[PDB]
Design a protein around this ligand. Structure first.
Ligand SMILES: [Ca+2]
Ligand SMILES: [Ca+2]
Ligand SMILES: [Ca+2]
Length: 214
């Protein structure tokens, strides 16, 4: 066998120590054994998180894990005798730090600039804003989707532009961009994670100051 990569959530609350798996050998059913665990998260930075029980072999976490820092741990528990000789070859222990949505979708610029050619056909791409998620790019924890919360001004009338829910590329979908009637628009663009869930997913805003060229 080996040890089926134990998946352990991010930011947990133990109370650490939190036992995971009691790494037992067969030699311990012969010679009395001494266990140790080496790999980052163990001995190597972060110095002290996963620790085995030298006596009982019970692997254990000592503080909550957090992916933005390390998302996965590869460890090796060692078996030694009274002479320092390894009695068994160091077992691999893959500790997957299962993710938890723990941060909003962040934009790359609190303000964004752009412009469209005044009288321009619908479909045109003004600018492209983006916001991402520090997540596990695969989970609706980091999947974003955008949408325009507001438009200023609103004349001729609003609903003039539109962001592609997934990409970012804003597009003018309403004729009449009059550099005279309104020479500068200030769009408020929002991005939410969890593919959009209005409560589950968290969100952010930014501004798309779209300008009307000659
Ligand atoms: Ca985290
Ligand atoms: Ca997370
Ligand atoms: Ca997120």
């Amino acid at each position: 066998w080996v040890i089926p990569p134990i998946n352990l959530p991010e930011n947990s609350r133990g109370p650490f120590p939190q036992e995971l798996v009691r790494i037992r050998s067969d030699r311990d059913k012969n010679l009395s054994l001494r266990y140790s665990v080496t790999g980052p998260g163990a001995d190597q930075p972060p110095t002290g998180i996963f620790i085995i029980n030298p006596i009982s072999g019970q692997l254990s976490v000592t503080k909550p894990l957090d992916r933005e820092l390390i998302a996965r741990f590869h460890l090796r528990a060692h078996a030694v005798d009274i002479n320092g000789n390894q009695v068994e070859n160091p077992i691999d222990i893959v500790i997957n730090v299962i993710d938890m949505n723990d941060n909003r979708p962040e934009f790359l610029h609190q303000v964004w600039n752009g412009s469209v050619p005044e009288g321009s056909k619908p479909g045109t791409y003004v600018m492209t804003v983006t916001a991402i998620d520090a997540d596990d790019p695969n989970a609706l924890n980091g999947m974003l989707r955008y949408r325009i919360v507001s438009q200023a001004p609103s004349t001729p009338s609003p609903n003039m532009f539109t962001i592609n829910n997934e990409t970012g590329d804003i597009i003018t979908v309403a004729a009449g961009l009059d550099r005279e009637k309104v020479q500068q628009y200030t769009l408020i663009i929002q991005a939410t994670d969890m593919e959009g869930n209005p409560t589950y997913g968290l969100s952010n805003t930014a501004t798309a100051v779209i300008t009307v060229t000659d």
